[PDB]
Write an enzyme that holds these catalytic residues in place. Sequence first.
Site, mmCIF file in Angstrom:
data_model
loop_
_atom_site.group_PDB
_atom_site.id
_atom_site.type_symbol
_atom_site.label_atom_id
_atom_site.label_comp_id
_atom_site.label_asym_id
_atom_site.label_seq_id
_atom_site.Cartn_x
_atom_site.Cartn_y
_atom_site.Cartn_z
ATOM 1 N N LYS A 1 20.004 -25.722 16.744
ATOM 2 C CA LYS A 1 19.761 -24.525 17.537
ATOM 3 C C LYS A 1 20.737 -23.410 17.187
ATOM 4 O O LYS A 1 20.370 -22.230 17.247
ATOM 5 C CB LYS A 1 19.877 -24.834 19.036
ATOM 6 C CG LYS A 1 19.018 -25.986 19.573
ATOM 7 C CD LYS A 1 19.648 -27.352 19.286
ATOM 8 C CE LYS A 1 18.748 -28.502 19.702
ATOM 9 N NZ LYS A 1 19.344 -29.820 19.339
ATOM 10 N N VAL B 1 22.763 -27.839 9.095
ATOM 11 C CA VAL B 1 23.630 -28.949 8.715
ATOM 12 C C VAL B 1 23.232 -29.454 7.334
ATOM 13 O O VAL B 1 22.043 -29.608 7.035
ATOM 14 C CB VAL B 1 23.568 -30.079 9.761
ATOM 15 C CG1 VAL B 1 24.418 -31.258 9.328
ATOM 16 C CG2 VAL B 1 24.024 -29.563 11.118
ATOM 17 N N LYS C 1 28.416 -27.595 8.376
ATOM 18 C CA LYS C 1 27.649 -27.008 9.467
ATOM 19 C C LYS C 1 27.815 -25.496 9.358
ATOM 20 O O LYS C 1 28.828 -24.943 9.797
ATOM 21 C CB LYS C 1 28.147 -27.554 10.803
ATOM 22 C CG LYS C 1 27.442 -27.049 12.043
ATOM 23 C CD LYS C 1 28.009 -27.759 13.267
ATOM 24 C CE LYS C 1 27.686 -27.036 14.560
ATOM 25 N NZ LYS C 1 28.426 -27.639 15.704
ATOM 26 N N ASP D 1 27.209 -30.941 26.823
ATOM 27 C CA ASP D 1 25.996 -31.114 26.029
ATOM 28 C C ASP D 1 25.827 -32.579 25.637
ATOM 29 O O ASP D 1 25.440 -32.896 24.506
ATOM 30 C CB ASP D 1 26.007 -30.216 24.789
ATOM 31 C CG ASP D 1 24.621 -30.013 24.199
ATOM 32 O OD1 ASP D 1 23.628 -30.380 24.863
ATOM 33 O OD2 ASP D 1 24.524 -29.486 23.071
#
Length: 332
Positions: free
Chosen positions: A48, A52, A67, A155
């Site tokens: 999102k 990666v 990333k 998260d």
Amino acid sequence: SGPVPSRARVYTDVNTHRPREYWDYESHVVEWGNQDDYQLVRKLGRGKYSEVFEAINITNNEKVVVKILKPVKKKKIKREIKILENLRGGPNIITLADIVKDPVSRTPALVFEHVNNTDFKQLYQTLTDYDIRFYMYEILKALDYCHSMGIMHRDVKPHNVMIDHEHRKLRLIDWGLAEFYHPGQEYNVRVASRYFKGPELLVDYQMYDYSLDMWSLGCMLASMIFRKEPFFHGHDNYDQLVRIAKVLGTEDLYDYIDKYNIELDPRFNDILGRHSRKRWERFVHSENQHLVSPEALDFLDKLLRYDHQSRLTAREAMEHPYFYTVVKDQAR
Ligand SMILES: O=C(O)[C@@H]1O[C@@H](O)[C@H](OS(=O)(=O)O)[C@@H](O)[C@@H]1O[C@H]1O[C@H](COS(=O)(=O)O)[C@@H](O[C@@H]2O[C@@H](C(=O)O)[C@@H](O[C@H]3O[C@H](COS(=O)(=O)O)[C@@H](O[C@@H]4O[C@@H](C(=O)O)[C@@H](O[C@H]5O[C@H](COS(=O)(=O)O)[C@@H](O[C@@H]6O[C@@H](C(=O)O)[C@@H](O[C@H]7O[C@H](COS(=O)(=O)O)[C@@H](O)[C@H](O)[C@H]7NS(=O)(=O)O)[C@H](O)[C@H]6OS(=O)(=O)O)[C@H](O)[C@H]5NS(=O)(=O)O)[C@H](O)[C@H]4OS(=O)(=O)O)[C@H](O)[C@H]3NS(=O)(=O)O)[C@H](O)[C@H]2OS(=O)(=O)O)[C@H](O)[C@H]1NS(=O)(=O)O
């Protein structure tokens, strides 16, 4: 008359007693490196907030994960970098190896130690009861470490739990939504995935703390022992609370609302209704009964509470009988 204030039961003032540099990430100075030290081998996914890649460090043939961050506020990049650096070396925490920028694009990218991922979709049905207990204990190690360091992950979900089942290693990843806990601070409730949002996020109570993560953990556990992923599967943020209320009942929900004087969104009273608190046996059948036990149900019930103060802390969760055997096996 405004919501009632709330403070974390544990690790309340960890950040207050540390030096300012620890938690004031907006003033953190980043030494950016050259992404040319890494050659991208293949694309692993497009998340999102970032893309990666599996990459190789051409200086020492080290396999790494790159990333590359999508355009976002530099404040959030500093926040994730500072949190990864503060937690570096902690139990079951992903390791930030480097911080680089593309020499032409100037796009920031974070380099991480490589972990042999196993997809949770195909790994769920592989897990026995003991595997579930073991990996839950590892996640609890990571969560208690980061909470004791004054940081909530915000998260927690299966996507952010890398597992190398061959070597039984576990890493909690994706700290781009994590924040430092400060007593009295009001946080953004538009965080975490919808299926794992705690009730405090859905009713717009901003003075939450580490206990949020614990709710998420409960959701994960509910999806594993019951073979129902996700367990609370709402259409939207209001239907999510409705799906929660149809299981935990509406009585405790309105008691929680009244205890903190939370102003409920008027479009909730049209859909919440009145529901009893369902016994967990309602969700047990022949395909998941081997993963369900009285200990698992007691632990899950102590995780999924409306009142965030009444949820088990990570440390309290590590001491539940559900993990006894695991602890026994860890003393060898
Ligand atoms: O670099 C490197 O790395 C390298 O290294 C090596 O290699 C070498 O070295 S050695 O030594 O070794 O040899 C080299 O090679 C290198 O280094 C070097 O070089 C380089 C280059 O060169 S040149 O030529 O170029 O010079 C360099 O570098 C550079 O630079 C850097 C820097 O700067 O840093 C970088 O850059 C990048 O990054 C950055 C960051 O970083 S860090 O470090 O920090 O991490 C960035 O920056 C950022 O940003 C900017 C801008 O903006 O642009 C600035 O900011 C500023 O301004 C602003 C304005 O505003 S407005 O309004 O107008 O817009 C301000 O403000 C801010 O923002 C805003 C907005 O956004 O809007 C706001 O926000 C929010 O909030 C508010 C609140 O209010 S109330 O009401 O509440 O009260 C609101 O209102 C609003 O609305 C909002 N917004 S939104 O949108 O969201 O809605 C506010 O205001 C704020 O924010 S915050 O967050 O803060 O709160 C601000 O404040 C300011 N700031 S100051 O600081 O100024 O004060 C800045 O700068 C910053 O910011 S901060 O924050 O951070 O502070 C940038 O941008 C980037 N760039 S890019 O391109 O990438 O994009 C880099 O590196 C470079 O650059 S470039 O260009 O080139 O790329 C260096 O330096 C050298 N070194 S030495 O040392 O030697 O010199």
